[PDB]
Structures are given as C-alpha cells and as structure tokens.
Amino acid sequence: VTTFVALYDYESRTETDLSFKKGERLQIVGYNHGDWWLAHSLTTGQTGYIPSNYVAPS
C-alpha cells in the first residue's frame, strides 16, 4: 500500500479525528484539498481525520 509518515505527535481532539505518533505509518483513505485527510493508522488499525500538514509521503 502507499503510505504517508507522521511528522509530529498528534492527540485526538474531536469525536472523528485520529491520534498518532511521530514516525508512524498512515494509509490515507480519503484525500481532500483542505486541512483534513481521512487516514487509516497502520500501527493501531483505527481510522479517522488527521491534519494534512502533519504527514509527508514515503
């Protein structure tokens, strides 16, 4: 699968967003030209919204 890598730690602050740690691998399951992407964490298996500027491509 194509993956992005987290640049920073992020603590979930909404009912729909996803917590993740720096360096973790995320599979983006919904791209959007905006501040939020829908991501699937390969570390935890959870799915939710993340800040698009918090990840970089592999």
Residue numbers in the entry: 83 to 140
Quote the passages of the study that discuss this structure, keeping the authors' original sentences:
The structure of this chimera shows eight molecules in the asymmetric unit. It is worth mentioning that the Src_Abl-nSrc chimera has low solubility (∼5 mg ml−1 at pH 5.0 and 7.0) compared with the Scr_Abl-RT and Scr_Abl-2 chimeras, and well diffracting crystals were obtained only after applying micro- and macro-seeding techniques in the presence of lithium chloride and glycerol to increase the protein solubility. At the same time, these conformations are different from those found in the WT c-Src and Abl SH3 domains. Although introducing residues of Abl into the c-Src SH3 domain is expected to increase the number of hydrogen bonds and reduce loop flexibility in all of the chains, residues in the n-Src loop of some chains show high B factors, and the loop has not been fully modelled in two of the eight chains (chain E and H) present in the asymmetric unit. Interestingly, although the conformation of the RT loop is mainly conserved, residues in this loop show the highest B factors in all of the chains. Introducing the Abl residues into the n-Src loop of the c-Src SH3 domain does not increase hydrogen-bond formation, as happens in the monomeric structures of Src_Abl-nSrc and Src_Abl-RT. However, Src_Abl-nSrc shows an ordered distal loop in most of the molecules in the asymmetric unit and this chimera does not form the intertwined dimer. Nevertheless, no amyloid formation has been detected for Scr_Abl-nSrc. All chimeras exhibited reversible denaturation except for Src_Abl-nSrc, which was irreversible.
The Src homology 3 (SH3) domain is a ∼60-residue modular domain that consists of two antiparallel β-sheets orthogonally packed to form a single hydrophobic core. This domain is present in many proteins and regulates critical cellular pathways by recognizing polyproline-rich motifs (PRMs; Kurochkina & Guha, 2013). Three-dimensional domain swapping (3D-DS) is a mechanism by which some proteins can oligomerize by exchanging identical domains or structural elements between monomers. In previous work, the 3D-DS of the c-Src SH3 domain has been characterized and its dependence on experimental conditions has been described. This work explores the role of the hinge-loop composition by interchanging residues in the RT and n-Src loops between two SH3 domains: one being the c-Src SH3 domain, where 3D-DS has been described, and the other being the Abl SH3 domain, where 3D-DS has not been described to date.
